[PDB]
Structures are given as structure tokens and as C-alpha cells.
Amino acid sequence: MIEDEMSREQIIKDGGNILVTAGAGSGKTTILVSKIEADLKENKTHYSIAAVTFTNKAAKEIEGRLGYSSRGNFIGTNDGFVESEIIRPFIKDAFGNDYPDNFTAEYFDNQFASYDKGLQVLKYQNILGTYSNPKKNFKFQLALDILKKSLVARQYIFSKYFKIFIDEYQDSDKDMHNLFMYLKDQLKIKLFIVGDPKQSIYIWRGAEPENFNGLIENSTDFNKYHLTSNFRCCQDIQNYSNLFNEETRSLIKEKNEVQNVISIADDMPISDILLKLTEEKQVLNIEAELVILVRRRNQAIEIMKELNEEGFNFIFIPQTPLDRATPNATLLKEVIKYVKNDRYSIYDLAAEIVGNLSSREIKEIQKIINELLVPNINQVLINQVLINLFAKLEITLDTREITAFTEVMMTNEFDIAFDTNEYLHKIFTVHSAKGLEFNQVIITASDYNVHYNRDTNEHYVATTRAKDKLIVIMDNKKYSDYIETLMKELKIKNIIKSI
Template identity: 45%
Template sequence: MIDQDERSEILENSGDIVVSASAGSGKTTIMVKKMGIELEKIKDHRTIGAITFTVKATEEIKKKAGKNIKKPFVVMTNDSFIESEIIRPFIKDAFGKDYGNDYSVEYGNKYQFDKYSSGLKQLKNKNILGSFDDNKLNFNFKVAHDILDKSKAAQEYIKAKYSWIFIDEYQDSDRDMHRFFMKLKNELKIKLFIVGDSKQAIYLWRGAMSNIFKLLDDENFSFYELVTNFRCDKEIENYANLFHNPKYYMHFDKNVENVVIKNFNNFNSFYERRDFVGFVDKFKDLIFEKTLDLDKEVTIIANYNNDANKITELLNLEGFNFVFIPKTPIDEGIPNGNLLKELALYSKNSTYTIYDFLENTHIDARIRTRFEVNSIIGKLKKDKNLVPDIVEEVVSDLANYLGLSIGVTVKYN
């Protein structure tokens, strides 16, 4: 592997570590290996913690670690970690006996607020932990950070229990989460192992910071990057490296099996562009030059149905045998059309749950988000609500909640 040296160094380095790793690069595997190595080094009562965003991710870590790690360790979601390890045990010590540790967690609109002091007042007087009405602010992590500031017992407990904290999918952390984790590292001196990929930052709508890894530059971490991908062909990996990791790009002087061609037509007018004047001649040139082999399958991809249909007609008039495969109406130029497909599945398939919707759309599956998204789209589970006005209302509310653009006109036959 072209990044084998980095993988080895990650396992040997005993300092704070940041690993930039794309999907398919074996990030969970190397994280679990590192967990096992650091656990074996611990000779006292301490352990390590692994923190993830979703229950599914915690189960994956448990499954992989269970095969190789024999010592006990802790795996939790972000919210579960701060609630069970910091907020509930130490809220009275930090804020006073008027705060109960048997509070309930509520995410309904009636329990939301705009100020931190209002959230604390509700927590104190009503024994309810609510949330900010601004998705980009994280009340739970603000409270946890505040408790660590005020409670010496909380500080000593965390330091006495954890030697390392492993944090997955760090690109989705918001400002309050980042501040909390840096407090663990800089003030409590707990080692951090951070894994993430800035290219996969998909939760900007709820506060994840696009510059999160830039902020880590000033935090005295050792940085590593995993570029070998185990899920795709090596030529695809090499092509991706050309854009994202040029130092790993491999130039081949010999013939290769697959070639990606990006070819531009220089149209002189709108009409030439509309009618694809000269396209067939250029296509024939590729065949004549033996760049394309018609004995193998050839796929031509166009942005629009009309373009693809026109290209098919022009080529087939010259004796070729292409088949036009149209996009569905949802695919055709609608921003975030995948959400509409999943909403259709959610509304029509009785076995398709809110958990399936969140996973397939890559929406953050933490409890609050699940509650709020379900409150928006849940009405689509009832057939009587599948009418244009309600469907448009649901799509609009979901788009507003996620901060996305979804252009759609609802039509019924």
C-alpha cells in the first residue's frame, strides 16, 4: 500500500493523533487496532473510550473489536457519553442541589429555547433537558463543558477512568463539541485519536464546521492520511488521488486497461450546441484512432434527458446501436432529489422506518434529529395525508430543517 508507512506510524505513535481517512480506507480497522495496542499499554485501572455519532457505528466498532480486544473498553455515541459520564453524575455538584439528575430529555418545540440561561432555567425548574431552537448550537455539549469547568469531581472522574478517547467522524463535529474535546486533551491531558474526512462533511446544516480540521492544526496533533481504498478499483483510487492527494498519484508509462477521457466540443453557437454538430465525427475519430473499442461496452453520460436522447439518435442514424436510458423525473435536475426518493419509500413501504430514512439519506441519526425529522415526515405514513398540499408541506418543512434546496412540483394522476 502506498500509505503503509503512515499506517505503521499511526500504530506506533503514542501522542495525540488525527487521521484523515476516506470511506473504504480501513479507518475503523486501524482505529480498532490502535485501541487494542493502547489498551495493552495501560497497567492501571484506566480504560479507553470510543465515541461515534450513531448507534450503528458503535455496533460496528464493538463487532470488530470483539474479535481481537480482550480488555474492557467503552463505546458510546457522543450524546450518550456526555450524558452518562458527565451531565447526570455531576450536574448537582456543578450547578447545585436544585438540579436533578433524573431529568427527562425532550426535543419537542415547546422545550426549545434561544438562550443558554433559558435552557438551564428549564433544566432546573422543570427537570427537562431541552435544546436550542437553532440547530447549529449544541446545548448538551455546552452543559457538559460547563460541568467540567465547575466540578472538580467530574474532572477527576474522567481523568481517572480514561487514558485515551477515540472519536470517529470528526468532520461532523460542531463548535461546542470541538471545544469540549479540546478541553479533554488540553486541560485533562487525555490522549485523543481523531478520525474523519473533510470530504464527507454532510452535517453543515446542523452546525458541523467546514474548517474543523483547520482548527486542529493549532492543537499539536500528529496528522496522518489514509489514501489506499479497499472498496474500489485501484485506477479509481489513482484518479481520486489526482484531485485530492496529488503526491500519491501514480503516472503509468505503460498501457493500462481503463482510460477516462474528458473531451470537449467547441461549439460555435447555441444551435450547434443544441444539435451536437460535429459530435458524431469526433466519436468516429475515437474509434478510428482505436481509443474506443466497440467490441466492448461503451456508455455515454449526459446531463439532460434531451441531450442523451439527441446523442442516441445521431449515433444510431450512423449505424451504431445505442440505447437511450432516461432519468426519472426526480433525477432530472432536482437538487437533493435522493431525499424525495427516500420520502416516497418511507410513505409507501410499511417496513421502511425512520431509521432507514436517516441512514439512506446520511442524515445525522442522533436522538434529537431522529425525533425532529420523524415529527416532520411522520404524517406521510398515513394514506389520507398523501395529497399534494400535505406532501408539499412536508417537503418544504424538511428542506427548511436541513437547510437544503429541494425544487419540486407535486403531480398526481
């Protein structure tokens, strides 16, 4: 039940304009496709919807969770939405016939900074580019001018689209905001705005955080909700998401028995704790993702050779220098995965660069990074990454980050292999388990943590990864005694069931 289910029940059954202030990650795509599926299920008319993001990887993820439809829905980025729905069909009507239809969007060499010379370029040499200042949008201004100037654009964009789904409004240009409340106010289109407020914004350099901070305090005509994506899936596991160390201890409900926790004998080894739970108890599954989040890397590698003598061959990726908090991890990880694997496609690298929709020009950067395929380990990485970041924009996000990227391929391999294919039985530490979710989390008692009254946030964020099953053992008698003391401190008699 609790906040996840009641927020889901409220948000799904709404019909008005919705504003969702969520947290960091935790499946915004899940609530987005659930609301999209509910809205498409309840509607039997001819109208369609438009889902809007920045990266088209999220677009193919959204249509993968959605499936197939021929109703006419638009899934993609806002650049493609403005290009194919407002600019291209009505540029010949809004600004006379002498303005041209068939045109190419290219924002890699253009740095002009006026509207007049911009539509002079669009009339004479028919190239649509970008503004010089990062906090502008020539395309959205042109779309707003087309919508205010052309009747048939208003008729089409009112007669086709029913709801518009905006994501990542925390980093959004003010021209996008102007076009979106113009679509909301006059043309009477419903809006589903999701996002998070402030908390270390990145992506699409030039963010204007006061946009999303403009419709939290002063806005009135918006049904507002907090985070609806759960911290943990299922129901019984969420109890320890409310544990923390203080205050939220009061917010947790009482239960006489929790079915999602299994406690076992501590005398025997885990390598057949797994064999007892999978075979004799039929609790765990080898074919499901089976991950122990632990720390103290020397005993982790000890567990590794113990498990290779067991036979299932657990794999370890440690904390890379790339794994530190940086605004540019997500693209250079794709660059290194395309370079050092051998067969990764260039469109998989193309799927993350800012606004994408880049045709005919992927070879300009694949030539540069194909020049990066020479090993040449001494000094060529600096200038080829320099001309790459001149090519791909988001400049001067480097110096420390170029060294963090350098230390990955130093010695030609950081860990001899990397996350190349899909394999099971992975192990992550607390420095790198954030972001990627695990089906079964089998922490193995969080060795010597609870009775010390410290190391508690580490096993808490270890338990944040679990979906359906998590196991906590009393590995020590004083560990069980401190568990009993802590559950006296909760004023709750049972939070853990031992079989």
C-alpha cells in the first residue's frame, strides 16, 4: 500500500494537467509508460498523444515498454516534434511560399545570434541551426511564430494531439516553456509534466532551473504530486526503505510477519546457502540476477575465488575512475564501449548526444573516433578527445574528467574486461551500485555492521537494490541482540521473519 500505491492510484485516475515532483531516477520511465498506457486504454477516439524527451534512447525504451500502435502517437525528442509537426508542414504557409519546405537541421557549425539573419539563412540557404548563447532556442521561437501566424497549424495541432507528456523540465529552455504554455492556454491541450526540482541538474547545457521552480510555489492550475515512483518495488521490502536511522522510523507501519525476508543458519558457508535456498527451500533462482552487495574488496576477491571453486563464476567490476560523479559520464562510456569492444554500432553511440536526430553527419565524428582506434597510449588521447569535444559540443567539462577518462585505458585495460555483454552473477560495491537495479539482492548479513551502530547507510543502500527478495542473517549472536535492541527502538516487535 503506502505512498507508492496511493500516489499511483491518484495519478492514474486523474484527467487534468499533472505536475510530478519526483526524486533521482528510480524509474520515471515506468510511471510515464504506465500513465501513457492507461490514457491510451481509456481513450477510444481518434486523438493521439506526444511523448517528449531529450535522448532518443529513452524514446526507444518508451516504445519498447509500450509496444506497437497505429493510432498515430509521437515518441521522440522535442527537436523532432518541433521539426516534423510545426516547422516542416507549415513553413510554406506561415511565412509565404518563398520560404522552403525541405531543409536540414545542423547545429554543429552555426553560431549566429539574431532572428533576422536566422530566417535570412532559412530563406536563402535553407539551413536551420542554433543560437550562439546556450540559453536560447531558434527552433522553438520559429515554432511559436508559425503557430501564432498560421491557422492550419493550430487546427492540426489541436485536432490531432490530446495529451502532451513532458519529462526533464528541470533543464529546459524558456522558449520551450513559452511554447508549452501557449499549447496549454489557448489551444486547450492537457499536459503531464514530470521531473525533479533542483538537486544537481545536468544535460543540455543552459538549464534555467527557475522554469520548473516557477510552477511549484506560485502556480495554481495544476494538480501537484510528490514522488510516485517507489524507492523499492513490491510491498514488504519497502519497510526497510522506511528504516533509515531516525525520523522515518515513525513513518513505518506494523506487521506481525514479513514474507519477503528469509533468515538462515550462519554456521555453514554461503556457496551452499545458495544451494539450500534454491533447491531445498525453492526460494532463490539461479536464472534470476543474483547479486551480493558487499564491501572491503580484498574479502570480495576472496569470495570470488571461493565462488570460482564453487563453480558459478561471479564477475567483479570495481570502482572505475570513470565512475565518479561527472556531468559527462554517459557519453564517453559509450565512446569507450564502442572503441574497445570492436563491434558496437555507431548509432548506439549516436543515441545519447544531447538532442540527437543527427543524420548524414555521424561520419564526421566516426572519422575522429576511428582515429581514436589506434592504441597509441602515450599522448594522442588528449588531442583526439579535444577535437571530439569541439565536434560534439558541451565544451570545457574536462581537465579532471579527461584524467578520469585517461586512467580507464591506462595499462590498456582497467580490469581486463568490462561490461560488454549480458551475463548473470554480478557483484557491485557501494561506490558503483547506484543507478542499476538488481532483481535478487542477497547481501549475506552485512558482516559486522549492526552491533557497531555504524556502517548502516551502506547496507541500507544495499537493500535499496532489491525487488522481490532480500535476505538478512544474524551472522553473530550479538548481531541478533542488537537487532532485538533496534526493534525495541522501533516500537515494532517483528520486522524480520526467520525460518
